Amino acid sequence: LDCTVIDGNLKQIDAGSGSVVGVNNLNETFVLIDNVFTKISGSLKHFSVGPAGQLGVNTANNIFKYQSGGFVQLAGLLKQVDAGGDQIIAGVNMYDDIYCLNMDANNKWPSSNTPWVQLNGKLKYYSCGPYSCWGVNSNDQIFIMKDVSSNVCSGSGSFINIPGLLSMIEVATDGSVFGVNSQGNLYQRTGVTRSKPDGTDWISMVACPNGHKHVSFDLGVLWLVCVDGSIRKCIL
Amino acid sequence: LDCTVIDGNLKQIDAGSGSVVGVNNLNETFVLIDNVFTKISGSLKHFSVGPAGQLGVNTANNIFKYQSGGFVQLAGLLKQVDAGGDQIIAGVNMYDDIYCLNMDANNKWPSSNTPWVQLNGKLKYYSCGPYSCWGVNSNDQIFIMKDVSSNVCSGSGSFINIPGLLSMIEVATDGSVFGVNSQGNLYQRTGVTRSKPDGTDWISMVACPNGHKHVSFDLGVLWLVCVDGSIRKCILT
Ligand SMILES: *[C@@H]1O[C@H](CO)[C@@H](O[C@@H]2O[C@H](CO)[C@@H](O)[C@H](O)[C@H]2NC(C)=O)[C@H](O)[C@H]1NC(C)=O
Ligand SMILES: *[C@@H]1O[C@H](CO)[C@@H](O[C@@H]2O[C@H](CO)[C@@H](O)[C@H](O)[C@H]2NC(C)=O)[C@H](O)[C@H]1NC(C)=O
Ligand SMILES: [Ca+2]
Ligand SMILES: [Ca+2]
């Protein structure tokens, strides 16, 4: 791929809703402002942005949402969280248990309860898009939850295995699906539509010179963290 | 309303998706970062943030969306634009024509076209929330469009008049509705729910000792631009 380098060093990156955010190995938190990854207050090991807001988790697995000028702590524990769904929150905890929060609950603040929904299965990484969520388990097996909607965040309730192996996976607001495998190779799912949410094939792509670490996609731009923590921007 | 004053001066403010943005009298563009309004690049006369993204318009009525590190120009002309709907964009042009953009179009990039849908009618201000949009016309009359959805952004197609007079109006991600009238009074719509999207009445409240100019609400915090451009950050009681 034809990609440009952009200054910075990260371990994780997420793009969504026109925003791009990430964290470095020190767990410092960054937002892309006028083409500069800009440090903001916060300690997070994973930071996500999309239609559901700006959501992250820290080393203690506490959950944070940027609101009204700064991070506020939500109730619950997750090791990874994603905000790419249709105003829903999704993620996994330290036991690979899988949770989502429906739109109406996400948008209620202050709240007297945080009504997490547990999904049936085990995943180590989980990401949502417009009509589905995708994740991978501890054996790098890939799964899709179909029929996900804003107030039925758990979708059909039954995960479907998609052949292949990936270590992480992200779903974009246009429905695009990208992931990186344990060997540091980068893949895109082809043939993904609302009518065929599972898509058809995995295609190989190269953005990094010596291996890929993390990937996210938004609005025609593929974002990579390479193995050395450096960043690539690939306008597709 | 229990308020603090946040340093700065704005003419317009919008809050949504946990973000707070706005523009000043000079059309400098701001985002609230770590409790400080921070200038970003851009000349905009209205800047909105919500589940549909970060959308603004400039003095020439060109439309801009923040994506991938900076503003990109979309097709079309609007004098006001809102991103509070469910991944839909809505707004009005200089002739008070009313438009919306469906979710699937909003999320498509590259796009050699921005396929705006025109709603029948005239409004000078239009704002969207989770299941409806509200607007006001040039005579300050108030309207709701119900059962707006991500890929039917035009909703029922039948604007319903809600008695009262307002100069602008905003709809929050939790469905809350607030507005400011021509005299600088501030109102909330009471009784708004999914079962009753039109609500029941208007209630007056004051955040600005010197009168109100603009309002937006998100996640339990009401944001005011006062008549003098000062900024109040409030919680409800
Ligand atoms: C940044 O966050 C990571 C992930 O939480 C921290 O690394 C973990 O630290 C805990 C102890 O606090 C250990 O139980 C884990 O084994 C560590 N995981 C990994 C992958 O290293 C890391 O220490 C944090 N760094 C800073 C500077 O805050
Ligand atoms: C900021 O934008 C406003 C709104 O476009 C500008 O005020 C308008 O200026 C135009 C000329 O470009 C006039 O035709 C309008 O009558 C003005 N409208 C209002 C409401 O005053 C304003 O000049 C801009 N300021 C800067 C520094 O860019
Ligand atoms: Ca994501
Ligand atoms: Ca708004």
Which residues of A touch chain B, with CB atoms under 8 Å apart?
15, 17-20, 31-36, 40-41, 51-54, 65-70, 86-87, 103-104, 107-110, 130, 150, 172-174, 218-221, 233, 235
In angstroms, the CA A51 to CA B49 distance is: 11
Q: Tell if the CB–CB gap between B54 and A18 is shorter than 8 Å.
A: yes
Q: Tell if the CB–CB gap between B173 and A54 is shorter than 8 Å.
A: no
* Nearest CA residue ID for atom 21, ligand 2: B25
- Which residue range(s) make up the domain with B229? 1-237
Tokens, residue A116? 């997490």
Whether ligand 1 lies within 6 angstroms of the CB of A46 is answered as no
Which experimental technique did the depositors report for determining this structure? X-ray
Q: A220 contacts in B (CB within 8 Å)?
A: 68, 109-110
Domains contained in chain B, number: 1
Tokens, residue A141? 């097996």
Name the H helices within chain A. 103-106
Q: Nearest-CA neighbor of A84 among A32, A29, A47?
A: A47
In angstroms, the CA B20 to CA B42 distance is: 16
Three-state secondary-structure class, residue B103: helix
Q: Tell if the CB–CB gap between A15 and B68 is shorter than 8 Å.
A: yes
Between the two ends of chain B, the Cα-to-Cα distance in Å is: 6
Pairs from B35-44 (Cβ < 8 Å, separation ≥ 24): B35/A69, B35/A70, B35/B6, B36/A69, B36/B7, B37/B6, B37/B7, B37/B8, B37/B10, B37/B231, B40/A33, B40/A34, B41/A34, B41/B70, B41/B71, B42/B71
Q: B40 contacts in A (CB within 8 Å)?
A: 33-34
Return all residues near A159 (Cβ < 8 A) that are at least 6 apart: A119, A120, A121, A135, A143, A144, A145
Which residues of B touch chain A, with CB atoms under 8 Å apart?
15, 17-20, 31-36, 40-41, 51-54, 65-70, 86-87, 103-104, 107-110, 130, 150, 172-174, 218-221, 233
Tokens, residue A185? 């190779």
Nearest CA in chain A to B51: A51
- Break chain A down into helix, strand, coil percent, rounded to 5: 0, 50, 45
User: Phi, psi (5° rounding) for residue B54?
Assistant: -115, 110
Return all residues near B103 (Cβ < 8 A) that are at least 6 apart: A130, B52, B86, B87, B88, B150, B151, B153
What one-character-per-residue DSSP string does A90-131 give? EEE-TT--EEEE-HHHHT--S-S----EEESS--SEEEE-SS
Query: Could you tell me the CA-to-CA distances from B123 to A153, B82, B97, B130, B146 in Å, in that order?
Result: 35, 13, 7, 20, 16
Burial state string for B155-186 with b = 16 or more CB within 10 A and e = fewer than 16: beeebeebebbbbbbbbbbbbbbbbbbeeebb
- The owner of tokens 């603009």 is B214
User: Phi, psi (5° rounding) for residue A104?
Assistant: -65, -35
Measure A85 CA to ligand 3 centroid, in angstroms.
Answer: 8
Whether ligand 1 lies within 6 angstroms of the CB of A45 is answered as yes
